Design a protein around this ligand. Structure first.
Ligand SMILES: *[C@@H]1O[C@H](CO)[C@@H](O[C@@H]2O[C@H](CO)[C@@H](O[C@H]3O[C@H](CO)[C@@H](O[C@@H]4O[C@H](CO)[C@@H](O)[C@H](O)[C@@H]4O)[C@H](O)[C@@H]3O)[C@H](O)[C@H]2NC(C)=O)[C@H](O)[C@H]1NC(C)=O
Ligand SMILES: *[C@H]1O[C@H](CO)[C@@H](O[C@@H]2O[C@H](CO)[C@@H](O[C@@H]3O[C@H](CO)[C@@H](O)[C@H](O)[C@@H]3O)[C@H](O)[C@H]2NC(C)=O)[C@H](O)[C@H]1NC(C)=O
Ligand code: NAG
Ligand code: LXC
Ligand code: FE
Ligand code: ZN
Ligand code: ZN
Length: 341
């Protein structure tokens, strides 16, 4: 009962979880699902306790009663005096990236180019970029804006899945979990890295993390930031250092969600867990680090300083904010009081 059940999405996270489970003398245990949605279901049922989510899935979750608990927080130059765990969360920039070498490509010349998405329903990989394209286009036929794409979660037999590749054998094509080569921030960015697609929808941290020898993965080894460009809304191309003035929007940090009749207990065990395998714990670098997955953002993003406390005891709408909630609303009608299960 001081014991928490985590929901691991996919085989790779199942493995980083069972590892965490050992180091905890099992104050943590794992449930496994092949997709984030099933993970949400397991939690509803009470068969699992929590998982960390991109704001896109939180929205879904909140309709079915789960609640924000703790948020991922990364390093800041403002809000420095404050400890991490109490520090306000800053959010992240949803950017759109292209290869510099690919001149002329602009936000205005994207109809029919090739896209790389983190997955369906996520914030920077989907709901932000598609909400805009649907919204400037007057259409809902957004499945027809990109001749070809990789968008984990969409129907395999569709064009949206044409650009994806499955694990080592080209099995599990387009599944919305890391087993897919082009799944999530890094997959999506590799997708452009290797010139599979013309554009990629990821967060800003992603470009910086896999370039100029930061990633050490063989596909990111020789990647050099200057070879990339951000596409702005005013149809302009700025270096990746201008993220602040050339972003599509800022997004709510991913966060741990749970059931309300559970929140308090997930929180308590977690801060303790965080104190031990977190950024400066009795056992991170020696025995086990909760935020190290090796450039693969397994369970938590790899750039998490710590899981922060919230503040006003958010209800997800507030946690996600009225801007974002609407962006998601006008978009899902193209498919409002709800759940989704
Ligand atoms: C886009 O997203 C990127 C990725 O998150 C942001 O870039 C990072 O910004 C941080 C603060 O804004 C930089 O962080 C600090 O803390 C570290 C150490 O505590 C400092 O130094 C390290 O020094 C060694 C030796 O040179 C190197 O290994 C490291 O690369 C680092 O330089 C650093 O001085 C700073 O005080 C962080 O370094 C930086 N990360 C990278 C890879 O550049 C970026 O701000 C964000 N942009 C926007 C507009 O939001
Ligand atoms: C494209 O679809 C709609 C069309 O407008 C966009 O939503 C609009 O977003 C703005 C800002 O969220 C809303 O304005 C707000 O009004 C409220 C009162 O309702 C006020 O409290 C706020 O201060 C703010 O000014 C506007 O009402 C809203 N309209 C609708 C119908 O949602 C949507 O965001 C667009 N999608 C994207 C991705 O840009
Ligand atoms: C297991 O939980 C109890 C309660 O906090 C605690 O005594 C102990 O530190 C935990 N063990 C580990 C390895 O976290
Ligand atoms: O709910 C909100 C919040 O908590 O932060 C500022 C926002 O703009 C908003 O919509
Ligand atoms: Fe995200
Ligand atoms: Zn802005
Ligand atoms: Zn409130």
């Amino acid at each position: 009962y001081t014991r928490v059940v985590w929901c691991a999405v996919g085989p790779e996270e199942q493995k980083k979880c069972q590892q965490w489970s050992q180091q905890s003398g099992q104050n943590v245990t794992c449930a496994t699902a092949s997709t984030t949605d099933d993970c949400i279901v397991l939690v509803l049922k009470g068969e699992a306790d929590a998982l960390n989510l991109d704001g896109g899935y939180i929205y879904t979750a909140g309709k079915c009663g789960l609640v924000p608990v703790l948020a991922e927080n990364r390093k800041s130059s403002k809000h420095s005096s404050l400890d991490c765990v109490l520090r306000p969360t800053e959010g992240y920039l949803a950017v759109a990236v292209v290869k510099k070498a690919n001149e002329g490509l602009t936000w205005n010349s994207l109809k029919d180019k090739k896209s790389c998405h983190t997955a369906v329903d996520r914030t920077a990989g989907w709901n932000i970029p598609m909400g805009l394209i649907v919204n400037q286009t007057g259409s809902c036929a957004f499945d027809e804006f990109f001749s070809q794409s990789c968008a984990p979660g969409a129907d395999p037999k569709s064009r949206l899945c044409a650009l994806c590749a499955g694990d080592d054998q080209g099995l599990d094509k387009c599944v919305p979990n890391s087993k897919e080569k082009y799944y999530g921030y890094t997959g999506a960015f590799r997708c452009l890295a290797e010139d599979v697609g013309d554009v990629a929808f990821v967060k800003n941290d992603t470009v910086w993390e896999n370039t100029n020898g930061e990633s050490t993965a063989d596909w990111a080894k020789n990647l050099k930031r200057e070879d990339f460009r951000l596409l702005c809304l005013d149809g302009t191309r700025k270096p990746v250092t201008e993220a602040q003035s050339c972003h599509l929007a800022v997004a709510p940090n991913h966060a741990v969600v749970s059931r309300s009749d559970r929140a308090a207990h997930v929180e308590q065990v977690l801060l303790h867990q965080q104190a031990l395998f977190g950024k400066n714990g009795k056992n991170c670098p020696d025995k086990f680090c909760l935020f190290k997955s090796e450039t693969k953002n397994l369970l938590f993003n790899d750039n998490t300083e710590c899981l922060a406390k919230l503040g006003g005891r958010p209800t997800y709408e507030e946690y996600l904010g009225t801007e974002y909630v609407t962006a998601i609303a006008n978009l899902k009608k193209c498919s409002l009081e709800a759940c989704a299960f």
